[PDB]
Amino acid sequence: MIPDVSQALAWLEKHPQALKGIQRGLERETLRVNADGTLATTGHPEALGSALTHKWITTDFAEALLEFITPVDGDIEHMLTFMRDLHRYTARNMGDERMWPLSMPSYIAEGQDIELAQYGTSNTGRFKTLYREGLKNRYGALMQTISGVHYNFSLPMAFWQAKSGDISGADAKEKISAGYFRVIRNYYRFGWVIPYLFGASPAISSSFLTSLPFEKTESGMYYLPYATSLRLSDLGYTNKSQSNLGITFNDLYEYVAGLKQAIKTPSEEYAKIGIEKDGKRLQINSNVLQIENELYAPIRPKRVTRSGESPSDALLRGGIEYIEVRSLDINPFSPIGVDEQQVRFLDLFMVWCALADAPEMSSSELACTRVNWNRVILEGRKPGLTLGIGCETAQFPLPQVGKDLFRDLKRVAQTLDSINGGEAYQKVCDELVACFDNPDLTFSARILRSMIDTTGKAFAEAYRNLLREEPLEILREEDFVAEREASERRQQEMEAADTEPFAVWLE
Ligand SMILES: Nc1ncnc2c1ncn2[C@@H]1O[C@H](COP(=O)(O)OP(=O)(O)O)[C@@H](O)[C@H]1O
Ligand SMILES: CC[C@H](C[S@](=O)(CC[C@H](N)C(=O)O)=NP(=O)(O)O)C(=O)O
Ligand SMILES: [Mg+2]
Ligand SMILES: [Mg+2]
Ligand SMILES: [Mg+2]
Ligand SMILES: [Mg+2]
């Protein structure tokens, strides 16, 4: 079921230096909560400054939903250490609050009055806060409190140069885009390996509640015995409302047209919420997507946007720069929600996705890759589980398939280790591959176990105390203070540069 990648892998070993220079970025989301596990009600910590403009730390959907963002970097350890510094500092400046260690909320009711993210009185600030008011009315606040880790990855220019030789910058920027869509297509096909290894939401609270055979634990949580990531299921951070959009990943102009056409596409269900009600705006528009950001795909095209420019516009201007892997649940066994084993595995898998051939895929061919994903999401650890090629009959045993993939991955790993020196990548392949015959080693089995034997509050507490005792390693306090001061200015500056009133800006 896994494609032959002999030729591309041969090319790679003949061109080892094509992998030197990989760049990475991490986004990690987490809920601020009280020691009793309830949602924190305080505002965005003052030591963090403006969330609107802050470089490293900001807010996602809710004002209590922190997001930590590492600046793009090519050193794994440095990046993860930088991420920990952001945690360390925040944990020493939110009083007695602490972070939620899991993707799923445990003590948040549906309809719970949850403060939207606030971004002050600027037109951009109010626009973002309004986007979120719209999300709340559409999907509900509860779902938008679901937290995840996003893995951001780019291959070096030297990769493309070794593939294509000397060419025009118009041609080369196109090749890059095509390269990344190929990656995306392979990710849709084979990316279910991610939930299977690192999925960490086999359980959920009552609030999230189908004919699925849920069971219970003494702590009051509902779970499926073989599930990996319900965050990715219809019950979690859903994109079902969006499955009719016909967006494809074959070509840059097509991708963008479908995505622009999706912002202009009326939805019947959202009209009913209404755009304006009793003087209070409730959403940006009544369309399937309010803006491009609302595309809840498991991976997406990307280019850092210039000022005022939209995601789609950057893409057309400079082509695809990097890809954003979005399918990672929070790592409950790491105080920073993500670890070096996962980062290293995603390096190997993303590189492999760039190497393997990926036939063009229609909208309905893409919808068909979901069947294996769903299998893994809802019952990935079930003994005997089989997978198929698309919508076809399941025939291939999951362990055999993962092993097949991993023979290729160890080869990529050998190349990466021979550049950086050491054996770290190869060692990660040896650890993870054992998970296929032994699903109890996966994240979803490990945390399911711990939830039955007793969790979210206990881990949060342990992770708070561990973090506060830890000195910063890369940044200093003065760095955090200067960034806070400077973000607060950037916000004031935006608040004073507005010439038109919020109302005219929109239209
Ligand atoms: N060239 C790139 N290659 C790899 N990662 C990148 C690159 N450019 C930016 N990134 C990373 O992408 C992430 C952007 O995060 P963020 O601002 O939260 O965007 P978004 O919300 O759309 O996911 C950063 O963590 C950054 O380090
Ligand atoms: C504001 C809400 C979301 C934001 S989200 O897509 C959320 C990701 C989600 N929590 C997840 O678990 O993957 N994270 P982002 O990558 O935009 O920082 C939106 O833009 O519509
Ligand atoms: Mg983000
Ligand atoms: Mg986010
Ligand atoms: Mg992201
Ligand atoms: Mg093979």
Side-chain angles (χ1 to χ4, degrees), residues 1-109 111-215 217-218 220-279 281-507:
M1 173 171 133
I2 304 297
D4 183 7
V5 188
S6 296
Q7 292 197 341
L9 282 165
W11 169 86
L12 176 55
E13 286 172 338
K14 294 163 193 217
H15 296 100
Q17 301 295 304
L19 284 181
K20 160 129 240 205
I22 291 166
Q23 288 191 110
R24 301 171 199 88
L26 285 168
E27 304 165 62
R28 187 251 155 132
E29 286 165 349
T30 177
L31 291 165
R32 283 186 286 110
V33 291
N34 307 294
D36 57 17
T38 68
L39 194 58
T41 58
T42 53
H44 185 62
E46 288 283 313
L48 310 183
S50 178
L52 181 49
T53 66
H54 201 286
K55 276 192 220 86
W56 310 319
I57 314 170
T58 175
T59 59
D60 195 75
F61 160 77
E63 179 77 359
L65 190 39
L66 289 167
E67 187 163 311
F68 300 112
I69 307 160
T70 62
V72 60
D73 195 83
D75 196 274
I76 286 170
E77 300 80 1
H78 187 274
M79 167 179 82
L80 288 178
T81 292
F82 194 106
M83 181 66 92
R84 212 146 162 131
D85 276 5
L86 300 175
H87 284 72
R88 283 154 175 158
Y89 180 77
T90 298
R92 281 194 294 268
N93 292 272
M94 59 207 294
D96 181 68
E97 300 178 353
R98 62 278 312 267
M99 297 162 227
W100 193 240
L102 306 167
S103 269
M104 296 326 220
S106 265
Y107 308 115
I108 294 185
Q112 177 158 331
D113 196 322
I114 291 159
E115 197 185 351
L116 317 179
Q118 308 296 307
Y119 300 104
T121 49
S122 62
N123 280 344
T124 293
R126 276 164 101 159
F127 183 77
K128 279 184 114 94
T129 278
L130 169 65
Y131 174 59
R132 288 161 175 66
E133 167 72 43
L135 294 178
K136 166 205 86 190
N137 291 318
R138 291 163 164 227
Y139 303 107
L142 168 71
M143 151 158 148
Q144 286 289 347
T145 65
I146 284 149
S147 77
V149 159
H150 297 177
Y151 174 79
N152 296 283
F153 164 100
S154 59
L155 289 155
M157 290 297 100
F159 186 83
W160 307 120
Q161 167 68 29
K163 217 206 156 314
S164 294
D166 282 341
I167 43 158
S168 80
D171 281 22
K173 126 185 138 128
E174 230 189 319
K175 238 101 183 155
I176 290 174
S177 291
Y180 279 125
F181 280 121
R182 176 200 221 154
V183 156
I184 284 168
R185 290 197 302 274
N186 276 330
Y187 182 91
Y188 265 90
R189 273 160 103 208
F190 309 110
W192 50 259
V193 70
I194 289 167
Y196 174 82
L197 293 176
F198 303 128
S201 57
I204 66 199
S205 79
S206 345
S207 306
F208 290 93
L209 301 180
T210 58
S211 26
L212 303 172
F214 285 95
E215 295 171 54
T217 213
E218 301 180 6
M221 306 280 75
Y222 299 86
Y223 76 93
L224 290 181
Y226 299 124
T228 53
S229 195
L230 292 179
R231 156 163 168 284
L232 298 187
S233 84
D234 288 342
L235 302 174
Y237 206 90
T238 319
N239 72 332
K240 180 161 256 192
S241 21
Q242 298 179 12
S243 39
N244 222 32
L245 293 189
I247 276 138
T248 57
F249 305 91
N250 300 308
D251 166 289
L252 175 64
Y253 285 179
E254 186 172 73
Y255 172 72
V256 166
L259 178 66
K260 291 236 193 167
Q261 190 183 90
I263 305 280
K264 282 186 165 199
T265 286
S267 144
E268 231 180 313
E269 190 69 14
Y270 296 152
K272 288 177 189 174
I273 298 159
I275 289 172
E276 209 172 331
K277 173 154 142 188
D278 289 336
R281 330 184 160 245
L282 309 163
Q283 34 178 359
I284 277 173
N285 63 25
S286 79
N287 300 302
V288 178
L289 308 186
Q290 296 179 84
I291 48 164
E292 296 112 348
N293 302 55
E294 204 170 329
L295 185 68
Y296 294 160
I299 189 187
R300 321 188 275 207
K302 283 226 131 114
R303 188 168 270 296
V304 177
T305 62
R306 287 184 185 176
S307 200
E309 196 188 42
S310 77
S312 12
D313 273 323
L315 285 183
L316 294 173
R317 166 193 106 230
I320 299 179
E321 191 181 354
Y322 73 93
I323 44 113
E324 162 199 26
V325 176
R326 299 172 42 96
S327 76
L328 272 178
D329 297 352
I330 298 299
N331 186 354
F333 314 105
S334 163
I336 67 160
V338 60
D339 72 20
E340 165 175 321
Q341 177 185 77
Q342 306 175 259
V343 170
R344 273 185 199 278
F345 165 81
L346 284 174
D347 276 5
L348 300 170
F349 184 59
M350 274 8 255
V351 165
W352 176 91
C353 280
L355 292 182
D357 272 310
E360 295 199 338
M361 296 176 70
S362 53
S363 327
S364 97
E365 289 172 315
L366 289 168
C368 269
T369 61
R370 204 164 193 146
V371 170
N372 292 333
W373 282 83
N374 284 322
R375 279 179 187 130
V376 169
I377 286 162
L378 294 168
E379 56 174 356
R381 302 181 276 100
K382 181 180 94 201
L385 178 61
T386 43
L387 304 180
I389 305 180
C391 282
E392 294 185 57
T393 310
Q395 336 175 4
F396 298 94
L398 186 147
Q400 173 173 348
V401 165
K403 284 163 196 169
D404 183 353
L405 173 59
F406 259 75
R407 291 193 297 276
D408 296 346
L409 296 193
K410 179 127 165 186
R411 294 192 58 199
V412 174
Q414 283 185 301
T415 285
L416 273 167
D417 284 337
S418 84
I419 299 159
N420 304 156
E423 285 184 317
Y425 280 104
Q426 282 168 83
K427 161 192 225 232
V428 153
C429 296
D430 290 344
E431 293 163 352
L432 291 173
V433 74
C435 289
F436 287 117
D437 288 325
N438 189 355
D440 284 352
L441 296 167
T442 63
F443 276 12
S444 60
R446 287 179 53 201
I447 200 68
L448 181 59
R449 167 93 280 120
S450 145
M451 279 180 170
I452 292 167
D453 283 1
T454 67
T455 290
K457 295 182 13 228
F459 279 24
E461 159 78 354
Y463 289 160
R464 146 179 173 102
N465 297 336
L466 195 77
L467 280 181
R468 321 228 309 140
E469 274 330 285
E470 273 176 17
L472 301 163
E473 291 179 270
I474 290 175
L475 300 167
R476 338 151 162 241
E477 346 270 322
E478 292 86 3
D479 299 329
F480 278 102
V481 168
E483 179 53 17
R484 161 213 179 154
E485 259 152 36
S487 50
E488 275 168 7
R489 293 200 161 213
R490 289 190 289 261
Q491 188 177 312
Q492 280 155 16
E493 285 155 10
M494 291 164 74
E495 274 162 359
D498 282 329
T499 59
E500 314 168 299
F502 185 37
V504 177
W505 195 77
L506 268 189
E507 282 178 350

